[PDB]
Structure formats: C-alpha cells, structure tokens
Curated annotation (Swiss-Prot), chain A:
Record protein name field: Kynurenine/alpha-aminoadipate aminotransferase, mitochondrial
Region Disordered: start-end pairs: 174-201
Leading EC class: transferase
Gene: AADAT
Example of a GO biological process term: glutamate metabolic process
C-alpha cells in the first residue's frame, strides 16, 4: 500500500512534539506539567448498575486531573486492542508497521476521528464515494472540504455493489497509479443500521465492495456506531475483519452503549494513517479527558469482557422492544398511507409517505424529522421522514403515529 | 471592521446542524438539553448512576440521579449555558471589554468553551491561514503553536523581544515594508495577525507592560491585523496588581483571547475558553461541532458547580493560594541558579508562570549536553531548539521548570548542570 497518495501535503508536514519525548530516580525539570497538589478536586466515588462502585483515591484523582498521552491512557488502549482482536481478528495485526500494521487511538468521540481522517485525505476537488441518505454530521464535515460527493445507489441491504461497479467504470484500474486522473480516494459507509435508513450491509455485499476497493485502490471508512445494536442472531463480519491489504479505517463509539457526554471513541486502522491522526490531535485537544478515560477503564476492569458483553445484551434487549413497539404503532395507523423497511440495527425507522412529494410541509415532531437533512441537496423535496424509537414510550408512539395518519389524510384530500 | 478578509473559504462554507437542540426549562424541574428531531441515546442505559466529588476549600459536589443523566448525555457545542454565563461575567469584571454592547456584526463580545485552550487556538489558526500568508510572532515561542502553524504553510516573521516581552520598535520596523493603505489591497499580502503570550511567555517567563500593549494595539489598527492573546498564565502573575489585557483595550473588536483552567483547576479535564468577536467565535463553534461536537458535559458540570459555589471571591482566593506556591518555587529555582550557575550562565527573573530560561555563557549548542549527557546523569530539562521555527539551528538556551521539583531536587539538578557546562568549556 502506497499510503503517500492518501496523506495530504499538510498532514505529511506534521512532526512529533519535542516534549513527548521526555515522558526511576530522575529529576524532571523538563515537562511543564502543573502541580496536581493545587487542584481543588480531591477524591471521587461513582455508583454503578448496581451496588458496584468506582473510586478515585487521593493519587488516582491526581492522575485523572493531569495531562495524559495523545493516543489514550495505556490501560484503555490495551483493553480495546484485545476487544478488536476477539471481535474482528484483523489480518493486519502482525504485519510490519510500514505494511499497514493494526493500530488504535482514543478520540474525543468517534466524530473527532472521522474529522481528522477526512482532513488528512481530502484536497479541494477530490472525488469521494458515499450513499444518500447519509448521517448529516458527515455531510456537514465534507461540505467545507470542497470535494465531489458521488452518490451510490442503496436498498434494504445497504450499498448496491452493481451501482458502485457502474460508477467506478468511468476510470480504469491503472488510473489509480496516475495522480492527475482523479480516481476516488475513499468510500464512506455506516454498515449497520445506517443513519437515517436503519438498513444493514450483508457479508456477500461487503466481500464484493472490498474486491472493488482493491481493484480501484481506495480506502474504506467504516463508521460503525451501531455495531453493538444489531437485532438479529449473530453479528455480520466487518470490513476490518476482511482487511487483507490494510485499506480500512474503522471508527467505534461508546455514545450509544456507555455515554455520549463523556466524548470517548476509538479509531482502528493502519499505523501510517493512525500516526497522522494522533499528530493532528496532538495540536488540537492534546488528548481525550484523563478523568473520563479512567472512569471507563475502571468500569471495564470491574466488568471484564463477560460483564461488558452482558451489558451490550441488556442494551440490545431494550432497543429490540422499542423497535417492536414502533413497528406495531406503524402497522396500526400507517398501513395504506406509508411504506417502511424493518430496521436491522440502531434506533431509527425510515418512513416513506405514499402520496405526498414534500413532507417538510406536513410536519408544520418529538420523534420525527424530514428526510431533507440527510441529503447533499437538502433543498430538494423529500417524501421520507425519520422516526426515532430510542426514548418514546410504546403509547407515546401510538399517540404520535395516530396524529401522523390524520395529517397524511388531510393532504391527500386536497388536489 | 471587515472580518471576511481574515478567514478562509472553508471556514465561511460551514453551516449549523440541521438537527435543532436546546435546554428544556419548560418541563419536570431539572433542566437538561433536548433534541427537536431527535436521536439522543437513552440515558437509562448508561452504567454510571450517581457521583460525589470532594473539594478542599469548597462544599462537596454531588451529581444525583437526574444530574448524572444530564452529565452523561450530549450538550451544546459552545458549552453548557450555566458555565458560559459565569465565564462572560468574569470577563466583564476582569477586562470590561469595549465590545460588550456592539452590534453582533460589529464584533460583539462572544465566548465558547473548548476542549482545552489548545483547541480554540487550533480552530482559530485553521480559520485564518491560507498557504503563503504572513503572520507575526516572537521567537522563542510555545512549541505547540509552532507545531500548529508549520503544516499551514504560512510565513512566520520574527519580532524582537526582551525582559519586557515584544519590543514595539521592532514591530514598527517590520511593518514599514508595507503602507497602511495596503491592508485594503488583497494582493499586497499584509500580516493577518500577531500572536503573543502576554504574561510569562513559554519559554522565557517574560511579561509585556501596559505602555507596550497600548503601542502594539495602535499598530494593529494602523495595519489592520488581529491580536491573538494566548494568556494561560494570566492568573499566575507574581507582582502586585495584574496588567490590563489586549481584550480590555479592544475598541475595534480585533482581539481573540484564549483562557485556560489547566494551570489553576485541572489540565486533564480539557476545559478552556475563547473570547472574541461573534463573527469569528461562530466560525470556531461551527468547526468544533464537526470535530468533538462539544466539550465533555460531565467535566463542565464539575467546574460550573465548583465556580458557582465559590463565587468570584472563592475563585480569587484559590488563584492566590496557587500563586503563593509557584512564587516560593520561583525563589528556590533562583537560589539554586545563583549557587551553581553564576559565572556559567545568564537569566531574567520570571514575571509569571512556571519556567526559568537559562542562557549558557560559553557554548553554542546545548543539545547533546541536555539530551544525552544529562539524562545519563539522571536530570531532565529541555533545550532551546524546540522553541524556534528553525529548530535545526544551534541554541545556547535551556528551559527549566519549577512547577514540581523540590528545593533540594533543584539544588542536586543545577549542580549536575554546572559540571556538564564545565566539561564542554574544557574542550576548544
Ligand atoms: C453515524 C454517526 N457517526 C458519528 C457520530 C458521532 O458520534 P460520537 O461517537 O462522536 O458521539 C454519530 C452521532 N449521531 C448523532 C449525534 C447527535 C448529537 C446531538 O447533540 C448535539 C450536541 C452538540 C452538537 C450537535 C449535536 C443531537 C442529535 C444527534 N443525532 C441525531 O439526531 N441522530 N444522530 C445523531 C453518528 O450517528
Ligand atoms: C502557552 C500555552 N498556550 C496554550 C497551551 C494549551 O493549554 P490547554 O490546551 O491545556 O489549555 C499551553 C499548554 N502548555 C503545555 C502543555 C503540556 C502538555 C503536556 O502533556 C501532553 C500530553 C499529550 C500531548 C502533548 C502534551 C506536556 C507538556 C506540556 N507543556 C510543557 O512542557 N510546557 N508547556 C506545556 C501553553 O503553554
């Protein structure tokens, strides 16, 4: 892999900090670390689910309130590496560092990793592959970068490989080696329960997508926050699991399973590219909150893999009942007025109103919002709406979908 | 003031999220933010339930059932409302900026919480710099800013400095290469901004005077350039009565000020704040929204509750306690420097912060002496090379930190320094 074609001139330029470096009877007058005996917070005790207790003693608190490495605290990084191995067993583990060895870093949410990755790759006028409708957060990130977003057709089983084949045919495999031909830099995808569709990719489709990424030499950006929210029996193999070449950048998030407000996520990918990301982070946020990482690592030490897997299962059990409750309310009132696909993962139900052309007109909420937001051209009319089942009660859903049905009936009465 | 002549095309392009949010107030009792769409994860799934944090010189902080659910959930990009209002009021009592009641487009004073003051600085640099732009700075400077500016392909023009910081006549001599009218002509390429650490500059420990700041501001109007006031050691000034800040004298709305809690409350919590004109602060909030989304909700609530219970009085008492320690540390480092380094080096007394900047009298390059000979001997310090744009050039200076070493750790270490200096002077 020639990683040089995926790193910008600005990203390449980045150098490591001269004081990082530096970091047993040493006298340190090097590092400008503030004195922790001056910090006002002294000890902490956080209660868990249930009777379980996390404790930050005198010294643990001093560590928590102080600076820490850019990539994350060592104990968190080692625990996460082991999880990635048991879940995905990537081919890249023992590869030489320059050949794309598997590396990890803790980010201030999964959004930070995605952002630094997009900024490392995109030069104004570069072609990027994506599937509409997409997560508004990535569209909002890509827009200022002045790149060309080429939409790939999708259905109930996510990205359609033949659409990607048809698109890619505008270039020749040999063109990737020629810089001035301008072949796609990457393909971005949410493989499980895409925001806003709730649709998931299959094993066969992923295999086919990977085969095209080798052929036309482009990276795969696996944004998988709903990986631990798959409804059906046995999780689908990830792009990272089949990454023989070291062309996959995977983003994981604790936001849907542990806490969204703590701002803790992780990026997995080849060492050359992960390095560039750590060097940018080193000049932005310096590192993710020491306190917030120690909170998760102490919880993880208490739970272990079993305790963590048992917790994911309790979260899946909650979202599965919510999904069933939104589907029942949808069946009761929307039948004859709308069409929808059963969500494979996540927290969203994507509704297509049968008659109407623009649904933004109809709403004029709570759990619903219009399709417009999930497109590059948000000014175009959309008959779709996104309903969230993460918080509404089964009876809150019934009441709301009953209001939807009447509004739909009103618009259909007028020519 | 045309703010647009300073920003990049990418910065302008940024839009707010289509998914609308806000703090409740109309419901239950405890206010927390809600999403008007909305895909907020269920907080009844989060494993952390309640929290109790002890405070030395304050009441014990407590996060109950509902407060914890708020803390573990998403929050606004600019910061939690209670922290933003408290910080705005502090900026008013400390700096009383002229820009407070100005129209928003005229550079009205605005604030935002960042994930450390480094994040604010970063987003600000990225907002302004286009490859080939001229920027004003004083060497030696904070390595973090140099490491930030280097990939941006901008031309760093060094301004001469002394014990009283930036020398206004050097800045006058530099600026003379253009005419005041040139700022209005895009193709003339006049400086976009001047970056400065006004109190206890990293690595010098030198501080700017009131008279010098006034003179610097007068030049920024004349040649129309912003002032980036990176002030983390503002609350670590060793002499009686703090010097007025650039923000305090900002009649035009040309000042972007960065503040940090790292040296006074906690560095590991990653909480800082940016103060400046609403048009430029918006651009910064909009970039943050696509990077980290917002600063940790938990970490903000912790500071907000401490600051609120303390009051400004409580806060000031704590900064006075902090300053007291570093001042004693500064005296110890100066004594150890007097004892061993006299005859071998020269230094200025630090006005603020945690660093002592030593110039070795004889030697030209302090690098192998500090990275090889000194580590072998068990003493850690930094060579001057790191604090320059051209880090490959030899440096006779070294930076010593007095933030943690004991008075006897200082004595032992400076005794090792003297022997190493004496060794190099023996060889021609
Ligand atoms: C596919 C995908 N990739 C990456 C990320 C980033 O995840 P991290 O790992 O960084 O946490 C997400 C998070 N998604 C949403 C966040 C969200 C946040 C909100 O609150 C704020 C607060 C401040 C600024 C903006 C939004 C209000 C509504 C929100 N929302 C929604 O309605 N659908 N999906 C979301 C994602 O879905
Ligand atoms: C003038 C000025 N302006 C803004 C900021 C940013 O302040 P905030 O973003 O925290 O508000 C600073 C921070 N200074 C230092 C940080 C520092 C951090 C370290 O720990 C890490 C950890 C991870 C990555 C990099 C460094 C190890 C040594 C460090 N160090 C040193 O030795 N001198 N000054 C520092 C500053 O001096």
């Amino acid at each position: 892999m020639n990683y040089a074609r995926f790193i910008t001139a600005a990203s390449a330029a980045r150098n490591p900090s001269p004081i990082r470096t530096m970091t047993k009877s040493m006298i340190s007058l090097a590092g400008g670390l503030p004195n922790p005996n001056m910090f006002p917070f002294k000890t902490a005790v956080i209660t868990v689910e249930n009777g379980k207790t996390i404790q930050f003693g005198e010294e643990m608190m001093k560590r928590a309130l102080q600076y820490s490495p850019s990539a994350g605290i060592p104990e968190l990084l080692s625990w996460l590496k082991q999880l990635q191995i048991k879940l995905h067993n990537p081919p890249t583990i023992h590869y030489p560092p320059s050949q794309g060895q598997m590396d990890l870093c803790v980010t201030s949410g999964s959004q930070q990793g995605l952002c630094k990755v997009f900024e490392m790759i995109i030069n104004p006028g570069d072609n990027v592959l994506l599937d509409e409708p997409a997560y508004s957060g990535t569209l909002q990130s890509l827009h200022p970068l002045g790149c060309n977003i080429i939409n790939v057709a999708s259905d109930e089983s996510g990205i359609v490989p033949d659409s990607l084949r048809d698109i890619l045919s505008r270039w020749k495999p040999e063109d990737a080696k020629n810089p001035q031909k301008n072949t796609p830099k990457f393909l971005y995808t949410v493989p499980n329960g895409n925001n806003p569709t709730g649709n998931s990719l299959t094993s066969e489709r992923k295999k086919e997508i990977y085969e095209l990424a080798r052929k036309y030499d482009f990276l795969i950006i696996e944004d998988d926050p709903y990986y631990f929210l798959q409804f059906n029996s046995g999780r689908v193999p990830t792009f990272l699991s089949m990454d023989v070449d070291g062309r996959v950048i995977r983003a994981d998030s604790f936001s849907k399973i542990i806490s969204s407000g703590l701002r803790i996520g992780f990026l997995t990918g080849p060492k050359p590219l992960i390095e560039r990301v750590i060097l940018h982070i080193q000049v932005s946020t310096l590192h993710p909150s020491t306190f917030n990482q120690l909170m998760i690592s102490q919880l993880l030490h208490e739970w272990g893999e079993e305790g963590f897997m048992a917790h994911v299962d309790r979260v899946i059990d909650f979202y599965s009942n919510q999904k069933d409750a939104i589907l029942a309310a949808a069946d009761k009132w929307l039948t004859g007025l709308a069409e929808w696909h059963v969500p494979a993962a996540g927290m969203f139900l994507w509704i297509k109103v049968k008659g109407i052309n623009d649904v933004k007109e109809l709403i004029e909420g709570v759990l619903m919002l219009p399709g417009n937001a999930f497109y590059v051209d948000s000014s175009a009319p959309s008959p779709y709406l996104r309903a969230s089942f993460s918080s509404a009660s089964p009876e809150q859903m019934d009441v709301a979908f009953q209001v939807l049905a009447q509004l739909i009936k009103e618009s259909l009465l007028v020519p």
